[PDB]
Amino acid sequence: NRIITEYILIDANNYHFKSWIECFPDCKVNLKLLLFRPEWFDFFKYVESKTYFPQLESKLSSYLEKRQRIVPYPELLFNTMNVLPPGKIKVVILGQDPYPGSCISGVPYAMGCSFSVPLNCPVPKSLANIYTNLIKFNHMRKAPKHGCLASWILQGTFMINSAFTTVLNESGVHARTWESFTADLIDYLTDNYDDLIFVAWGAHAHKLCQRVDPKKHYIITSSHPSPYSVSNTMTSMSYGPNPKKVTYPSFNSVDHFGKINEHLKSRNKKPIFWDL
C-alpha cells in the first residue's frame, strides 16, 4: 500500500504505523508478513527451515501476550531490508539494540534502522558524533538538523541492529532473541555476495564482523561513537587459533567514510553521497 519513502523517510508528527498488538490482535506473530521486498524471500525461506525460527516467533508472541510495547513497530521491523535488496548492499553498519526511547507523544525513536531516528525527533548523541566525524573529514560541512538516514540507506548502506527489537523504555532486553537470525543474515550476505564493506563500531559489532572472511570482504573497526567511547580506543577479542584482545582506534580519529569511499572507488563501484 506504500512506497519506500513512506517507510524510510518517517515524520514523527505524521506517524501512522500500527503497534504490534494492532497488527497481531491475537498475538499470531508472523514475521514473513513484515518483509515486503521479494529479493529477500530466498533468505527468509532458508531461515524458516531452521529449528530456532519457530522459537523466535514463539518468544515474540509471548511478549505480545504480556502486552509488552515492542519497538520498532512491525511495519518498520525489517525497514532496511525492505529498502535494500541484498544485491544492492554496499556497506553493512551494525548497531546493537534499537533505541528504547520515544517522543513526548509516544512515537518510538526506533525505526528498524541502526542509528537512525524519524524526522522531528532529537538527534541521539551517537548519531551527532557520527555527523561530527563526517564534518571532520570533509564529507559534510554542517550537521543535518534531523537524524533520519534514509539517504544513506537508499544508496546501499545496510544499517541494521543485531537485536531487531526491544521494549519501549527498556534497553537491550531482547539481546539473545535475534542472535541466530542475525548470524544467518550475516552468513547469507557473505556467502552470496562479494567485496562488501563491514563497519564495526564497538566490541559487539566487531565480534559479529569476525563471522566475515576478511580477505573476501573489507572490515573497518574502531570504538563506538557513543559519548562514553567516542574518543577512547577500544579493546576487543580477536578470535582464532590464538585468541587475544587487540586495541582499535577511537571512533573520532578514524575516517570511516573516507575509507568506505576509497574501497568502493578501488573496486570501481558507484560511490555513496553522504551529504546530499
Author numbering: 95 to 370
List passages from the publication reporting this PDB structure.
In the BER pathway, uracil-DNA glycosylase (UDG) recognizes uracil which exists in DNA and creates an abasic site by cleaving the N-glycosidic bond between uracil and deoxyribose. Interestingly, APMV UNG (mvUNG) is longer than other known UNGs, suggesting that it contains domains or motifs in addition to the canonical catalytic domain. mvUNG (residues 1–370) contains a catalytic domain conserved among UNG family proteins. Additionally, it has an N-terminal domain (N-domain; residues 1–130) and an insertional motif (motif-I; residues 327–343).
